[PDB]
Design a protein around this ligand. Sequence first.
Ligand SMILES: [Cl-]
Ligand SMILES: [Cl-]
Ligand SMILES: [Cl-]
Lengths: 81, 142
Amino acid sequence: MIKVLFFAQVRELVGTDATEVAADFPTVEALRQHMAAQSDRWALALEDGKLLAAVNQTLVSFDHPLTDGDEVAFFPPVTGG
Amino acid sequence: AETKIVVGPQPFSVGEEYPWLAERDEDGAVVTFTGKVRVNALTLEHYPGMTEKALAEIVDEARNRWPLGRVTVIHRIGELWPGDEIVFVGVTSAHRSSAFEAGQFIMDYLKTRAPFWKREATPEGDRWVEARESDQQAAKRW
Ligand SMILES: [Cl-]
Ligand SMILES: [Cl-]
Ligand SMILES: [Cl-]
């Protein structure tokens, strides 16, 4: 499956830290759209133009392809030190 | 050529990190940057499986842009207070320009790509610290 992790505000709004989805999406974007479509909260969380994505712990374009076993993470712009 | 990457809650000491970073004679230029929390406690949320890797991806890119020697990057997590040291970047090179530029770059990319998020424990509740457009611009120049 693909494991999807959420952080910070995104996490708060989506209401879970992590979830699994089938590897039936060609790209991060396709997955983002599918997740956004689950509820108004998910759409709010996962429709921000500044949302960031990581695949296997690397930041990637939303056009990045997905593959079974990947870990995807969606999170807001970062604020570290 | 070695890189030290540490992400964790423990405090660090510039005097403890400096000797190692500066040890090689061929590393004639040593630059460090320490960033402190700027009264409310901050808590740094992070993506653990990614923070070290992201910091390492930034140093790898710096090494391709500049001829660097030892590099150390430390970023803390957990609850910190104004004045506390949150981040340390140590970079070495033969010449100052490379060392300064790589330090600046490493910081700029850390501030826009490393998955940490600060929350401030204010009187009315926790609040997420806002990302700064200035960090975006700084990062985009590289
Ligand atoms: Cl859609
Ligand atoms: Cl700064
Ligand atoms: Cl700078």
